[PDB]
Design a protein around this ligand. Structure first.
Ligand code: CL
Ligand code: CL
Length: 162
């Protein structure tokens, strides 16, 4: 199990514009296109993003291309962030995947908002951080995916994904 396979389980794959769990226009493997209500704002961003006239539909290849970009951007974002980087550095390989997952889903700004949980991860208090992280909108909104990521942090294994 790796970060790609983990996120692919959590986000799914869709070759046609769709709405995310928050009502936002998305495509492929969790690639948010726009928070705007307009399907046209969405189709536009989509062509801008692929380099072609897509008319709201893309190929597997294109979805995977977008996915490679986003994981890379998530990882470079963590490494540039003064609040996230020390946390990442302190972690083992599995838990590092868990923080990448949160960052891909909720953006750097949103995870950086989990001040308390981050401090506990950093101090290696697994159980405490799992409990605190569950007290969030995130957990209340996508509970199954949140539980999966939270277990990854608690245990340091891929159990929740197998
Ligand atoms: Cl809460
Ligand atoms: Cl969920």
């Amino acid at each position: 199990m790796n970060i790609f396979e983990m996120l692919r389980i959590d986000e799914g794959l869709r070759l046609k514009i769709y709405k995310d769990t928050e009502g936002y226009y998305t495509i492929g493997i969790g690639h948010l296109l726009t928070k705007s209500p307009s399907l046209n704002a969405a189709k536009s961003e989509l062509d801008k993003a692929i380099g072609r006239n897509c008319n709201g539909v893309i190929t597997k290849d294109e979805a995977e291309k977008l996915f490679n970009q986003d994981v890379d951007a998530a990882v470079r974002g963590i490494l540039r962030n003064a609040k996230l980087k020390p946390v990442y550095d302190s972690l083992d390989a599995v838990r590092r995947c868990a923080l990448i997952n949160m960052v891909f889903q909720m953006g750097e700004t949103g995870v950086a908002g989990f001040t308390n949980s981050l401090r506990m991860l950093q101090q290696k208090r697994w159980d405490e951080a799992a409990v605190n992280g569950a007290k969030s909108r995130w957990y209340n909104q996508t509970p199954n995916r949140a539980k999966r990521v939270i277990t990854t942090f608690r245990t340091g294994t891929w159990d929740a994904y197998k």
